[PDB]
C-alpha cells in the first residue's frame, strides 16, 4: 500500500 489519499492497497499489503 501507498501514501495516496486515500490510501490504496494493491495486495497484502503494498
Same mark, same amino acid.
Given at each position: *500500500?501507498?501514501?495516496?489519499? /486515500? /490510501?490504496? *492497497?494493491?495486495? =497484502?499489503? =503494498?
Amino acid at each position: *500500500c501507498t501514501a495516496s489519499i /486515500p /490510501p490504496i *492497497c494493491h495486495x =497484502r499489503w =503494498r
